PDB file of C-alpha atoms (C1' of nucleotides) in Angstrom:
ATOM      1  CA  UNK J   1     -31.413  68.625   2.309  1.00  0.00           C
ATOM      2  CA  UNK J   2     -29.285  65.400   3.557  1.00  0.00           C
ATOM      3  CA  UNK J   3     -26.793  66.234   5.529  1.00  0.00           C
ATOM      4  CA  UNK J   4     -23.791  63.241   5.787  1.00  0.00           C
ATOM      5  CA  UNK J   5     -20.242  62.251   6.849  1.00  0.00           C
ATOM      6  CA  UNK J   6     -18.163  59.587   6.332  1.00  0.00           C
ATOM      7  CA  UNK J   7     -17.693  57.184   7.164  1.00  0.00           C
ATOM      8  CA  UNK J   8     -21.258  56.217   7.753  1.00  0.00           C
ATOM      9  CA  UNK J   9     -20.966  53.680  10.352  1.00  0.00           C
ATOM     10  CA  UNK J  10     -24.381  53.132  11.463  1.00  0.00           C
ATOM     11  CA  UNK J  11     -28.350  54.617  10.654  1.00  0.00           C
ATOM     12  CA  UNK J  12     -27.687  58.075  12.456  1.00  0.00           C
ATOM     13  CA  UNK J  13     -24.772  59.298  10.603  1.00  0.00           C
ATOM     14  CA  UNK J  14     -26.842  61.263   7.960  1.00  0.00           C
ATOM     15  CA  UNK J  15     -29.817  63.087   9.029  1.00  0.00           C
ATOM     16  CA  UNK J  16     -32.743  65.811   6.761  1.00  0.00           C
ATOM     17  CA  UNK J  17     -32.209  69.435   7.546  1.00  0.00           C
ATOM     18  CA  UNK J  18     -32.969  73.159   6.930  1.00  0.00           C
ATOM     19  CA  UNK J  19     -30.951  75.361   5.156  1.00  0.00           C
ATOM     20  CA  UNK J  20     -30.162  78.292   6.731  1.00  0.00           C
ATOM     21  CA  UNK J  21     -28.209  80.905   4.513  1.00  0.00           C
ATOM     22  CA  UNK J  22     -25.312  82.261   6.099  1.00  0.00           C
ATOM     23  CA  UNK J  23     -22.162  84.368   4.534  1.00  0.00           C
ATOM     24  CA  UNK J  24     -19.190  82.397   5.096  1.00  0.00           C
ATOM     25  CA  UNK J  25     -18.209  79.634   3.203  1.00  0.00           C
ATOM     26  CA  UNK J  26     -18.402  76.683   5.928  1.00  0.00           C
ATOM     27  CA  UNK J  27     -21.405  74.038   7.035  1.00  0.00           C
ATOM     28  CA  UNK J  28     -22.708  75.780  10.384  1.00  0.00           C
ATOM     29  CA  UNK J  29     -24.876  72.969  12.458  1.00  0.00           C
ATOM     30  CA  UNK J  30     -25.890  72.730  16.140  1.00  0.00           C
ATOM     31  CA  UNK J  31     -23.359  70.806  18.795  1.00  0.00           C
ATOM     32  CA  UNK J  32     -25.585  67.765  19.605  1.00  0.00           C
ATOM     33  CA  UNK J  33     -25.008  66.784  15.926  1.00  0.00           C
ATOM     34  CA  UNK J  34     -21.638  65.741  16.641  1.00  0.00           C
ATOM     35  CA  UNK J  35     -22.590  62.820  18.748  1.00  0.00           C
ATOM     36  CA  UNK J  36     -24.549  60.817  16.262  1.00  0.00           C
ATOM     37  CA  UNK J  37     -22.209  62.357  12.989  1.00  0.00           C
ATOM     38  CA  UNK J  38     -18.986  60.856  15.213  1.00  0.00           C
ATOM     39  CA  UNK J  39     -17.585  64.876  14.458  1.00  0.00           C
ATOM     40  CA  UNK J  40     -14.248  66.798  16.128  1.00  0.00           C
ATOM     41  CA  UNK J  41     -14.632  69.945  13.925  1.00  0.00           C
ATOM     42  CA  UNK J  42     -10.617  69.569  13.731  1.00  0.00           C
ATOM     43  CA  UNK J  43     -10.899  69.382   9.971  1.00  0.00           C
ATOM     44  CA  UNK J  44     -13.910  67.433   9.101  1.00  0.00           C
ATOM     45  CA  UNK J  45     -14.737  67.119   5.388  1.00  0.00           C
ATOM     46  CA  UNK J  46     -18.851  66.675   5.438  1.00  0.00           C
ATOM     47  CA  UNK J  47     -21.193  66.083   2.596  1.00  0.00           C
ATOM     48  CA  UNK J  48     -24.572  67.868   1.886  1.00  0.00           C
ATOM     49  CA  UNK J  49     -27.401  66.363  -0.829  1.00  0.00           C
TER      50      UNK J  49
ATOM     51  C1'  DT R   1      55.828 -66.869  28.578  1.00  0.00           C
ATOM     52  C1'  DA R   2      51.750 -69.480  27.511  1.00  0.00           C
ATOM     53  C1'  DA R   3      50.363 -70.881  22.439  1.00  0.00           C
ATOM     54  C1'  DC R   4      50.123 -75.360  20.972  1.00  0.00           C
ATOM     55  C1'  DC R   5      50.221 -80.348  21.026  1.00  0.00           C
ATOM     56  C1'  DG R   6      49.444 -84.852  23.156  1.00  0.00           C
ATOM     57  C1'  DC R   7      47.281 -87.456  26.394  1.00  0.00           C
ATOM     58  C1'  DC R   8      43.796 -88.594  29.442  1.00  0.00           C
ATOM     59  C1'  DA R   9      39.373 -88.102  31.935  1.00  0.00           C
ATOM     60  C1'  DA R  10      34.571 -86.702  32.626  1.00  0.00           C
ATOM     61  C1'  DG R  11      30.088 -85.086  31.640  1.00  0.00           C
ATOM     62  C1'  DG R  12      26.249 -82.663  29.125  1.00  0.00           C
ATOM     63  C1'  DG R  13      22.998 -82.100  25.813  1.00  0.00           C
ATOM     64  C1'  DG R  14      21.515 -82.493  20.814  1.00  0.00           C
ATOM     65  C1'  DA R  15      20.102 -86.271  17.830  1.00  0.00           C
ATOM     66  C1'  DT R  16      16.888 -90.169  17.425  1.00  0.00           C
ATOM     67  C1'  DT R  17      12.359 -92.925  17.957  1.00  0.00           C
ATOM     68  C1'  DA R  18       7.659 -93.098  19.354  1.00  0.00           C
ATOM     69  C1'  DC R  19       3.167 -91.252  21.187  1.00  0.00           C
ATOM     70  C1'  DT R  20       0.059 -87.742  21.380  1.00  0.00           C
ATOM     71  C1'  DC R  21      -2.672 -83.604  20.539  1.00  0.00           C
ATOM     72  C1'  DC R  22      -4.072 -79.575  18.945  1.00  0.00           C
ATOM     73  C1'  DC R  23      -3.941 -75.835  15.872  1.00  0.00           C
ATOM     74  C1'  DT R  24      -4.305 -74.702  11.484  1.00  0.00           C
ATOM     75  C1'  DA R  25      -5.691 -75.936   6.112  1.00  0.00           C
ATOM     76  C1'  DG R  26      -9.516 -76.369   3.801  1.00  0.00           C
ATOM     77  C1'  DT R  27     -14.428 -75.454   2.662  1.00  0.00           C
ATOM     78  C1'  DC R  28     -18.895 -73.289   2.999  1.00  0.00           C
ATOM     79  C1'  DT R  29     -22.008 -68.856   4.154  1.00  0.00           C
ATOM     80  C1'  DC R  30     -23.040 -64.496   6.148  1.00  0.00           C
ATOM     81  C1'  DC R  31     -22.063 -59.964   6.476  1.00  0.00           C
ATOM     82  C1'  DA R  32     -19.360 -55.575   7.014  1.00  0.00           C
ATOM     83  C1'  DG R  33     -15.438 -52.478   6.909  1.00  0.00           C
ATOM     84  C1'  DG R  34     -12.363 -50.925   2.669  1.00  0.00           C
ATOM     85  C1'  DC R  35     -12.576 -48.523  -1.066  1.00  0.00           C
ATOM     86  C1'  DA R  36     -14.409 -45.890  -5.400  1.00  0.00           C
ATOM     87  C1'  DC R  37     -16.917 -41.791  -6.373  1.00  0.00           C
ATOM     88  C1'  DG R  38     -18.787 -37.076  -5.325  1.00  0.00           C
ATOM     89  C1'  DT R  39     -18.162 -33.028  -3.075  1.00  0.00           C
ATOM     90  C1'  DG R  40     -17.482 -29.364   0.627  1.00  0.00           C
ATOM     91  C1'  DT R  41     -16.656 -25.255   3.151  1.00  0.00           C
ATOM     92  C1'  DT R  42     -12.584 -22.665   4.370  1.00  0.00           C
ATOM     93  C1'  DT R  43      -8.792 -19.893   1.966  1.00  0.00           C
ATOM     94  C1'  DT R  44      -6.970 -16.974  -0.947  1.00  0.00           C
ATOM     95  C1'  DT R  45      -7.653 -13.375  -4.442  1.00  0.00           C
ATOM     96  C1'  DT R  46      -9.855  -9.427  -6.300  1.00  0.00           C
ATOM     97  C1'  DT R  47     -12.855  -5.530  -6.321  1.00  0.00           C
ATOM     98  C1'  DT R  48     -15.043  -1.562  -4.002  1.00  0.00           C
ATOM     99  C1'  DT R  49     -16.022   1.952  -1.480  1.00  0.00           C
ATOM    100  C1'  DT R  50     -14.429   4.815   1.890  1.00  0.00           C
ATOM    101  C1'  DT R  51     -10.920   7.446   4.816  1.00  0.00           C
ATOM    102  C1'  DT R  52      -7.588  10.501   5.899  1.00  0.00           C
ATOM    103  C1'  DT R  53      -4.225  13.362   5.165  1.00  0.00           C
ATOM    104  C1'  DT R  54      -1.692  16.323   1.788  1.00  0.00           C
ATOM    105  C1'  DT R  55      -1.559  19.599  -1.750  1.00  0.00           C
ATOM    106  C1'  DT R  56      -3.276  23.091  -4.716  1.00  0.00           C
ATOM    107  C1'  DT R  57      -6.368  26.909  -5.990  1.00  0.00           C
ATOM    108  C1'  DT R  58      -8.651  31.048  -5.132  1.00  0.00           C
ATOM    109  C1'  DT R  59     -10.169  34.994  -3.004  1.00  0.00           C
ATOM    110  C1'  DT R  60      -9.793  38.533   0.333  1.00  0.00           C
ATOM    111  C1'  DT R  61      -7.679  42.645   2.704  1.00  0.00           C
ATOM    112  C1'  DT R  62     -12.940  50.091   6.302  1.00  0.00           C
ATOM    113  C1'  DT R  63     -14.647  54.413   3.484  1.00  0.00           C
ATOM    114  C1'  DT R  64     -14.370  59.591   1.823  1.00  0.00           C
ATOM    115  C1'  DT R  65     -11.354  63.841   0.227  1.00  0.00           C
ATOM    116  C1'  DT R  66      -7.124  67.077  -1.591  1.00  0.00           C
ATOM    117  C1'  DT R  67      -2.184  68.152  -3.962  1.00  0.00           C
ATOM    118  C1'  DT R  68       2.065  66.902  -7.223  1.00  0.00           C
ATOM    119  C1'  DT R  69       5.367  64.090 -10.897  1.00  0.00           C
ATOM    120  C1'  DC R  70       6.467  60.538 -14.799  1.00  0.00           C
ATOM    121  C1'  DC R  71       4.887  58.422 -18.535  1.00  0.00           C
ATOM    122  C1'  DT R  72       1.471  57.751 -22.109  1.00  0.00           C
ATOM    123  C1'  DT R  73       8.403  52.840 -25.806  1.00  0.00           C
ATOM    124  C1'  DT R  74      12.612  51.134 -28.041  1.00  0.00           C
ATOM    125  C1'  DT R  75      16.058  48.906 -30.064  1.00  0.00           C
ATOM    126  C1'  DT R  76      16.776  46.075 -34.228  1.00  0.00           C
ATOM    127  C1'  DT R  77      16.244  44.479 -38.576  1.00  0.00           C
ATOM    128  C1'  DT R  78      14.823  45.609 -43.274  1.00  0.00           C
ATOM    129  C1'  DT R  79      14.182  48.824 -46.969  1.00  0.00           C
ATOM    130  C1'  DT R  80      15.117  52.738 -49.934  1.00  0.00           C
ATOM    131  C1'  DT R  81      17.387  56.739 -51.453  1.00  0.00           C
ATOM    132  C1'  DT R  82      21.861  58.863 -52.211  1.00  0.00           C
ATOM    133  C1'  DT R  83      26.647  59.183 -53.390  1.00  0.00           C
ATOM    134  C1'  DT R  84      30.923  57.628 -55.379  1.00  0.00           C
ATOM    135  C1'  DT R  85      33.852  54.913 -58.654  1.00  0.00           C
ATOM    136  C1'  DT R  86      34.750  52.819 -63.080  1.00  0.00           C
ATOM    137  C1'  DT R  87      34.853  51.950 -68.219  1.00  0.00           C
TER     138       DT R  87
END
DNA sequence: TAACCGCCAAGGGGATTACTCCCTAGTCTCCAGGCACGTGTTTTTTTTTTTTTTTTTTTTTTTTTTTTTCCTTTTTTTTTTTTTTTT
């Protein structure tokens, strides 16, 4: 799947992944996404494709 | 108080006559500046293209997502039905 938020400021902000199913009702990623995706997890609305 | 007149005295130079001489009047003859005709090269006028600034027009303003509220006409003129009064 694509994997994306916004705003997309550059090439790295939307990357392929894996699904994974998990229960609960929120996107669960690993940390060193955060650095390329420009996340806080303080809120952050994120798209999936 | 000396203009003016009368009287007298003295002298100076313009008029007159004659001789001379020399400069111009007149007449050829050659030739050259004075003048009639043509025109010019600067001067002004007009176009021509650009320049330079001012003014006007137009277009633009990071992305994604989630809730309410209000409104989505309105007065103003014309028409048409109804009701009341009169003979």
């Amino acid at each position: 799947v694509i994997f994306n938020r916004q705003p997309t400021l550059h090439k790295m902000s939307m990357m392929g992944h894996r699904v994974k199913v998990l229960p609960w009702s929120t996107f669960r990623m690993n940390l060193s996404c955060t650095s390329p995706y420009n996340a806080d997890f303080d809120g952050d609305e994120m798209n999936l494709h």
